[PDB]
Each structure stands twice: as C-alpha cells, then as structure tokens.
Amino acid sequence: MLLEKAYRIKKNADFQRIYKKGHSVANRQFVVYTCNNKEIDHFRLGISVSKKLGNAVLRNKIKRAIRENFKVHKSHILAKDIIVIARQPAKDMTTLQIQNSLEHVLKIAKVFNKKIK
Template structure:
C-alpha cells in the first residue's frame, strides 16, 4: 500500500498541480507534473473517469497505477504526479499499463 505522504488526495492539491500546466500524454495516460518544494519525495494523484467502467474496474485501474509508482519509486524524479487514465486503459493488463506509463514518463523526462 502507498503511504499517505506519497498520495495526493485533496482537490486543492490536484488544482495546484494542474495550474503548473506541465502535461505529457500518450493514448492511454495524461500525466501532469509539478515540482514540490517542501519535500524530497514524489507524490501521486490518480484520476479515473466513470466512463472507464464501474467502481470495481476503476479501483482496479487505480491499484495498478499505484503499484507501478511503488515499483518504480527509486527511478522517478521527486515531483508531484497526477495521472489521468484514458479509455484504452480499461482493456489493458498490468504489463501493458506499465509499458505505457514508462513511455509517457520518458517523454516527460522523469524516469531514470
């Protein structure tokens, strides 16, 4: 499970990341980035639209994204990430999602 200090939960925190307007995308994900001046670790917020499926399916997608960020924590820059899942994600397994997230994070130059 991802520790509380690594999560973005509040609407206000999401808005602060969106205001920076640094976003990178591929067909499956949009990632918004923001530097976090107070901490030296990353924080992750995840948004999955109701259009992607029922609550069970959306929670499964969120869990997989969280697992990805835990697994690759040491390779990622200490920034704030807001991940928005797009439609194709609903039909992907974990390995496809992982490949897609690595791809979009390489575009953003956030992964070592």
C-alpha cells in the same frame, strides 16, 4: 529519517496544483500530470481515472497496475508532483498493459531520474 505522505495527494489543492500550471502529457490512453521539474521534496503521488472508462474493475486495474508499478518506481520517482490519470480507452488495458503505459506516458512525465531499462 524517511518521508511521509508528502509524496502523496489526498487534498484538492495538491490535485489542482498540477492541473493549475503543471505540465501534463499523455501516451495513448494514459496521462500524467506533474509540476516543477524539481522544485519539491516529495513526488506527490496521485491516482485519477475517468467516468467513461467502464466499470470499477476498469478504474481499478488502471489503479492497481499503477499501484504495483509506482511501488517499484517509488525509489525511481523524484519530487516534482507526479500523477497518472486514465484517459478513458485505457479500460481495454490490463494489469499488463496499464503497467506498460507508465513505460511511456510516465517516461514523458519526467518523473524518472533517467528511467531504467
């Protein structure tokens, strides 16, 4: 009795949804798009970056550091379309900062039942 990719995004509609009427934010160099504060049953996790960021190593760190966080916050995120896009200057960030990004942008997304300290 578990969930599937339901809490994932591999389509366009799933990516357009949030971008549709979803409520996107942005900290400093990271933005998170979400929809329906709580009208789903799986936190549609998604990953997006910019084309100005820099190299693939930049579009990766922003991903990895993210794929490393959401992993722990996996059981901290609730259903309500959740995504994290890299502004552009987030390239300067690292697996240390990139993670410290969700500590805000994400904290704003509202994809946290409360947000542990």
